[PDB]
């Protein structure tokens, strides 16, 4: 909403400040052209220095949702929402998100009425095996980019109100500020759910004078 | 004592590029002496094709020609060509919706339901049929 | 108006016998990439 906040000057907060003075203060008619002009720089900054990385990044190569395979999307979701140390999903709504995506994968690549291979999302407590099952049943999904409709569906369910906000930036558009800023305070207490357990990516509220 | 999820097919239209075999099989098909015998600047190939006709595109026309009836992908393509269905992405009756809607009523349509909703009208208004004055300036 | 014509089209796999394995493999990789881009474009263009 534009209110000042005192935060520790981490790389993530420094990126926040840079965007504040370079992107988020732009008028509406200039926001999209600027994002489009700066896509590569913005994506690299997100992946390097922020707690919400660019979602469509496969093995360090920046991409788009339209340029990812279904399998790549599923694995990226598991990589960003599933904690290996605790062997659990950080929260159950992200589990539901990934399960919804896998159900859509099955719907896209199935030829007739069939039983879902994910009967209960509780099967996703071992995400690797569930992904292997889904993409062994539908191997064509490992080498086909997302149908445009499924891109739209993915971005729609990134905007689900009854769901913890997704821990990544999925698209650059008029709602980039919302994607970048929303739900930014929990990561300080749960570094196990940050990309490299890196505190420098997170935002920590602290007073300047009281810091002494 | 007190108190299975089924998955519906969604149309996945393919471009149908030619399948490319391993070099071993493809080498088996043509004489071994053909390698380096031909001036490939003098060999003409077809790299793409298309059509607009009474049975829609080349994909839907071929489905009708070879199999006599439309698959799910063919039915969805014919429905979209004829303007029966249109894509929607946004709030629809408040709730968000991503998918096909009936072009006239704007009600959501599942891919599985396209055949039941539309196939009969698609077939009635495709191919050789009585001349429709509205298509030819009265 | 006495317009007679004939064309003969031959199966595309006979072309590949004319080239080396390395050239064929590089062609296959390029075609696969192009086909994925074409699918992306086709579906975007269709729904919009």
């Amino acid at each position: 909403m534009g209110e000042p906040i005192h935060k520790i000057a981490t790389r993530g907060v420094m990126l926040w400040k840079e965007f504040d003075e370079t992107i988020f203060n732009l008028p509406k008619n200039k926001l999209v052209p600027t994002l489009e002009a700066k896509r590569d720089y913005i994506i690299s900054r997100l992946n390097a220095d922020f707690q919400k990385p660019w979602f469509a990044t496969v093995n360090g190569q920046a991409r788009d949702l339209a340029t990812m395979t279904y399998e790549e999307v599923a694995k990226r979701l598991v990589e960003l929402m599933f904690i290996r140390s605790t062997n659990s999903w950080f929260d159950v709504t992200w589990r539901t998100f990934t399960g919804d995506f896998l159900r859509r994968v099955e719907e896209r690549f199935t030829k007739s009425k069939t039983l879902s291979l994910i009967q209960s999302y509780s099967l996703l407590d071992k995400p690797d095996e569930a992904i292997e099952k889904v993409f062994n049943a539908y191997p064509a999904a490992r080498e086909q980019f997302l149908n445009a409709q499924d891109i739209d569906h993915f971005l729609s369910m990134c905007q689900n109100p009854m769901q913890k906000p997704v821990p990544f930036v999925p698209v650059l558009d008029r709602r980039f500020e919302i994607f970048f800023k929303k739900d930014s305070l929990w990561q300080s207490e749960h570094l196990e759910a940050v990309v490299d357990q890196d505190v420098q990516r997170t935002c920590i509220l602290h007073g300047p004078v009281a810091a002494q | 004592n007190g108190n299975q999820v089924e998955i519906q097919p969604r149309a996945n239209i393919q471009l149908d590029f030619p399948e490319l075999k391993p070099y071993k099989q493809v080498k088996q098909i043509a004489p071994a002496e053909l390698e380096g015998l031909l001036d490939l600047e003098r060999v003409i190939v077809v790299t793409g094709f298309a059509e607009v006709g009474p049975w829609g595109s080349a994909r839907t026309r071929w489905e009708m020609e070879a199999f006599g009836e439309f698959s799910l992908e063919g039915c969805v393509e014919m429905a979209w060509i004829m303007g029966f269905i249109s894509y929607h992405n946004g709030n629809l009756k408040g709730r968000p919706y991503t998918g096909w809607v009936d072009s006239k009523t704007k009600e959501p349509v599942d891919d599985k339901d396209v055949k039941a909703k539309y196939e009969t009208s698609i077939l009635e208004h495709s191919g050789i049929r009585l001349i429709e004055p509205e298509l030819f300036n009265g | 108006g006495q317009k007679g014509g004939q064309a003969i089209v031959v199966h595309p796999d006979y072309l590949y016998g004319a080239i080396t394995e390395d050239r064929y493999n590089e062609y296959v990789a390029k075609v696969s990439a192009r086909e994925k881009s074409a699918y992306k474009f086709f579906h975007n263009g269709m729904i919009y």
Side-chain angles (χ1 to χ4, degrees), chain A residues 1-27 29-119 121-195 197-212, chain B residues 1-94 96-103 105-138, chain C:
Chain A
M1 327 81 81
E3 317 300 356
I5 321 171
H6 271 131
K7 304 187 187 174
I8 297 180
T10 62
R11 304 201 264 95
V13 166
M14 296 321 285
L15 180 67
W16 186 309
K17 203 176 178 61
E18 187 184 312
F19 286 170
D20 256 5
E21 54 218 20
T22 279
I23 298 174
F24 304 142
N25 62 14
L26 299 171
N29 52 278
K30 287 201 74 217
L31 177 55
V32 167
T34 307
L35 292 171
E36 211 38 20
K38 310 185 66 47
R39 147 173 308 259
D40 304 346
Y41 175 73
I42 291 167
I43 283 171
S44 60
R45 292 318 301 287
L46 285 180
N47 284 336
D49 295 341
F50 199 49
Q51 64 197 2
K52 293 196 190 307
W54 182 244
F55 176 76
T57 306
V58 189
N59 217 44
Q61 150 180 92
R63 299 228 210 140
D64 296 291
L65 273 170
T67 281
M68 271 165 99
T69 62
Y70 288 85
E71 190 190 13
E72 280 168 343
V73 169
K75 286 198 209 219
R76 183 68 165 160
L77 289 176
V78 162
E79 183 198 5
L80 290 183
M81 298 161 139
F82 189 81
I83 315 309
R84 300 294 196 191
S85 313
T86 76
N87 202 335
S88 47
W89 295 81
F90 188 65
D91 85 299
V92 80
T93 64
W94 295 356
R95 218 254 305 271
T96 292
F97 187 106
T98 300
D100 284 359
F101 175 71
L102 294 171
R103 292 264 181 84
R104 170 58 66 86
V105 165
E106 299 176 39
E107 292 167 9
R108 182 67 58 201
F109 288 88
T110 197
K111 299 311 225 143
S112 40
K113 275 261 291 309
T114 196
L115 283 163
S116 175
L117 289 201
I118 314 297
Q119 283 297 336
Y121 290 163
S122 310
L123 182 91
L124 282 169
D125 282 279
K126 262 194 294 298
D128 285 7
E129 284 67 11
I131 277 172
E132 281 293 356
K133 195 201 221 293
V134 161
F135 290 98
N136 281 1
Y138 303 100
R142 295 199 171 102
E143 67 221 15
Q144 183 196 278
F145 292 149
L146 261 47
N147 194 312
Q149 306 183 67
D150 293 338
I151 288 159
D152 279 357
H153 177 80
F154 179 99
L155 293 177
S156 192
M157 61 195 229
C158 272
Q159 289 282 115
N160 186 352
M162 299 299 125
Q163 176 197 284
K164 182 174 171 59
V166 292
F168 49 70
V169 181
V171 61
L172 294 179
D173 56 342
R174 44 155 193 111
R175 29 175 208 261
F176 177 51
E177 175 143 53
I178 285 79
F179 274 118
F180 181 86
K181 288 186 169 170
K182 170 151 49 48
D183 204 20
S184 51
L185 307 172
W186 62 269
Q187 296 91 334
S188 308
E189 328 196 338
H190 304 285
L191 289 180
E192 67 272 15
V194 188
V195 169
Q197 295 78 34
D198 187 13
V199 53
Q200 286 295 322
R201 307 176 93 94
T202 60
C203 86
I204 297 157
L205 281 54
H206 209 248
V209 177
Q212 301 168 308
Chain B
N1 306 89
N3 301 344
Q4 293 280 61
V5 307
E6 223 69 25
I7 271 155
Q8 289 324 303
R10 279 167 121 94
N12 194 22
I13 297 168
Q14 303 300 312
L15 290 184
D16 191 19
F17 280 20
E19 184 276 341
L20 292 169
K21 306 185 184 183
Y23 186 74
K24 288 59 60 196
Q25 307 173 22
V26 86
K27 192 108 201 84
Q28 285 334 94
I29 89 150
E33 293 88 9
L34 190 66
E35 186 179 351
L37 181 60
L38 292 186
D39 177 12
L40 300 187
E41 282 173 351
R42 310 277 301 165
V43 174
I44 310 305
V45 296
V46 174
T47 72
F49 64 92
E51 73 189 39
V52 167
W55 284 101
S57 73
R59 290 175 299 270
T60 56
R61 191 268 301 130
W62 172 251
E63 277 188 5
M64 185 49 48
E65 196 186 323
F67 315 110
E69 100 276 22
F70 287 122
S71 69
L72 181 60
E73 286 71 19
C75 204
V76 164
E77 214 198 290
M78 283 300 279
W80 174 91
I81 285 168
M82 287 168 97
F84 287 128
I85 60 172
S86 296
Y87 180 73
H88 185 89
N89 185 41
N91 279 350
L92 185 65
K93 305 297 189 178
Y97 182 69
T98 277
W100 299 111
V101 310
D102 176 291
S103 287
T105 72
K106 308 297 175 200
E107 286 297 287
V109 184
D110 301 321
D111 291 33
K112 78 150 172 323
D113 295 332
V114 167
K115 177 163 157 57
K117 278 215 56 150
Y118 299 116
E119 181 128 307
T120 295
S121 68
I122 287 163
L123 296 177
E124 154 170 13
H125 296 292
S126 282
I128 302 165
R129 58 193 190 278
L130 294 169
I131 285 149
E132 307 189 2
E134 299 78 17
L135 303 174
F136 303 96
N137 310 117
Chain C
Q2 302 192 352
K3 283 257 181 169
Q6 185 174 38
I8 308 297
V9 184
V10 165
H11 198 278
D13 284 350
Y14 289 93
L15 191 274
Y16 307 119
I19 63 177
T20 63
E21 183 157 356
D22 302 285
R23 187 176 182 185
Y24 178 69
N25 290 328
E26 70 165 342
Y27 167 71
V28 167
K30 292 153 74 154
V31 179
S32 67
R34 181 176 293 281
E35 190 280 335
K36 274 191 287 292
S37 292
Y39 171 93
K40 153 173 150 69
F41 177 97
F42 171 78
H43 279 292
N44 179 280
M46 163 160 187
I47 64 172
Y48 295 123

